[PDB]
Amino acid sequence: LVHVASVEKGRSYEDFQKVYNAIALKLREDDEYDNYIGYGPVLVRLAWHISGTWDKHDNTGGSYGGTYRFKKEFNDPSNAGLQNGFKFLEPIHKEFPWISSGDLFSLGGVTAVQEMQGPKIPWRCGRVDTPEDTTPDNGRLPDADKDAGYVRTFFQRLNMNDREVVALMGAHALGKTHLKNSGYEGPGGAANNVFTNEFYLNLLNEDWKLEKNDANNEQWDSKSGYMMLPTDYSLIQDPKYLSIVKEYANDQDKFFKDFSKAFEKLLEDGITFPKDAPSPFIFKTLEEQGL
């Protein structure tokens, strides 16, 4: 399967910076969502789940085709709760009907991270919508109730290595688990709509307790009111993972730099970019624009 990036006709940096600003302006406006967390965390989760279907072996799945717009992927049990990120973006797609679905879902994730004061993420245009029959089947996204060997093995399919996996998981400092979506409940920290390295700090400094929640699932709970998933706590159980966790709890700039590279790579897996294709765009935030 080859998927070649095709820039939307005649579009350039300024067009996509207009779509960025539209998403970012609505993130500021619709602030009440999920008890004032706002839409940013569900939008970086949506960009991860449309990319996380990729399989390196046959180049199926991935962010290129925008296939989450089809019922099979929209109704995947693993995507429960992401309909709220879709409905947030649907106004903006009506306003810029020329951007492809893959591009709009991935730029929403980029915009949310930078607007929640994360690192800049280089983003590239050119994903092309593909037919309903290209939609990957349910079951390619990871279970939460498993251990470190499962996480390592699952992420080899998206060929991410240990460092990349640990840098990507730092995004679980954002938002929260919702019992009616996943059977898990609670936030992982106090700053859950500002991008920081707090996931790593909480993992190493809190007093975790294995408890059973109302959906009868086990999760790691702390006195402070935070929770960690079994696959999250996995990172301090494995010796290779645990020493990268310590590296990111001791250096927030290295965390930001490595997250930026692994999230771009995540979003680009499966796509062939021609050598005459434009460079990756670095978008300015509303704040850097005085907007």
Contacting positions for ligand HEM (CB under 6 A): 41-42, 44-45, 48, 81, 142, 144, 151, 168-169, 171-172, 174-178, 181-182, 184, 229, 231, 263
Q: 263, exposed or middle or buried, with CB in 10 Å at 0-12, 13-18, 19+? A: buried
Of 89 and 174, the one with the shorter C-beta distance to ligand HEM is 174
Of 106 and 231, the one with the shorter C-beta distance to ligand HEM is 231
Of 195 and 208, the one with the shorter C-beta distance to ligand HEM is 195
- The CB-of-278 to ligand HEM minimum distance in angstroms stands at 25
- The CB-of-143 to ligand HEM minimum distance in angstroms stands at 6
- The CB-of-48 to ligand HEM minimum distance in angstroms stands at 4
Of 128 and 200, the one with the shorter C-beta distance to ligand HEM is 200
Closest chain position to ligand HEM (CB): 175
Return phi, psi of residue 64, to 5°: -45, -55
- The CB-of-45 to ligand HEM minimum distance in angstroms stands at 4
- The CB-of-193 to ligand HEM minimum distance in angstroms stands at 9
Return phi, psi of residue 108, to 5°: -55, -45
Of 104 and 168, the one with the shorter C-beta distance to ligand HEM is 168
How far does Cα 246 stand from its chain's mean position? 22
Of 79 and 128, the one with the shorter C-beta distance to ligand HEM is 79
Contacts 24+ apart (CB under 8 A), 79-82: 79/49, 79/141, 80/181, 80/182, 81/42, 81/178, 81/181, 81/182, 82/42, 82/45, 82/46, 82/49
Task: Check: CB of residue 229 under 8 Å from CB of residue 144.
Answer: yes
- The CB-of-267 to ligand HEM minimum distance in angstroms stands at 10
Local structure of residue 123 (DSSP, 8 states): B
- The CB-of-92 to ligand HEM minimum distance in angstroms stands at 19
Query: What tokens does 65 get?
Result: 């085709």
Query: What tokens does 38 get?
Result: 């706002």
In angstroms, what CA-CA distances link 223 with 36, 55, 205, 210? 23, 39, 12, 12
Alpha helices of 119-169 — where are they, by DSSP H? 148-156, 162-169
**Interacting residues of 113 by C-beta distance below 8 A, sequence separation 6+:** 40, 44, 119, 121, 195, 263
Task: Check: CB of residue 65 under 8 Å from CB of residue 4.
Answer: no
> What's the CA gap between 239 and 245, in Å, rounded?
10
Of 89 and 128, the one with the shorter C-beta distance to ligand HEM is 89
